[PDB]
Write a protein that binds this ligand. Structure first.
Ligand code: 4ZP
Ligand code: K
Length: 164
């Protein structure tokens, strides 16, 4: 079945809760496997201890830059970047999990969780999952963002992994 993974998130060292995500390995197996492996840390690197570096209320919460912690880094389990797998899944609403990028075929490790429908990203960002549980946790993260994307507290994925 599709992986179920989790991110345990804190704000300045205080726990906000758990976000549980389904990864659509059935539609985007390579993108799903990348994220799954970065949650478990099984390749020797990943998301544990990294931050939500860009959080824009009424838009999305962005994370996964585990090298530079600011949107300029990250890498995949494959290499520094990998191709856009397909654009089959769309940005249909809040809770969509999608790859951040710097243009075509630049996926690494950065990702975003949508807090609104972001349909203008369809065909540009590879959607690969959605929130199963903890949209209230996403909403708390969203609360610490700003229109500039800068966060008012340090938002940290303190643990992460695979449930099934
Ligand atoms: C809502 C999603 O928004 C975005 O993706 C907007 N764009 C960014 O944030 N770009 C920053 C970004 C995102 C993903 C990969 C890279 C990258 C690629 C290659 C080498 N180094 C870094 C950069
Ligand atoms: K805007």
């Amino acid at each position: 079945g599709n992986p179920l993974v989790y991110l345990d998130v804190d704000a300045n060292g205080k726990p906000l809760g758990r976000v549980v995500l389904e990864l659509k390995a059935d539609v985007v197996p390579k993108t799903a496997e990348n994220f799954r492996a970065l949650c478990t840390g099984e390749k020797g690197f990943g998301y544990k201890g990294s931050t939500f570096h860009r959080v824009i209320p009424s838009f999305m919460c962005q994370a996964g830059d585990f090298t530079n912690h600011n949107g300029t880094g990250g890498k995949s389990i494959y290499g520094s970047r990998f191709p856009d797998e397909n654009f089959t899944l769309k940005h249909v609403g809040p809770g969509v999990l999608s790859m951040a990028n710097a243009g075509p075929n630049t996926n690494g490790s950065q990702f975003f969780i949508c807090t609104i429908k972001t349909d203008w990203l369809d065909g540009k960002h590879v959607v690969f999952g959605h929130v199963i549980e903890g949209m209230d946790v996403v909403k708390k993260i969203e609360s610490f963002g700003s229109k500039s994307g800068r966060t008012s507290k340090k938002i940290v994925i303190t643990d992460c992994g695979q449930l099934s």
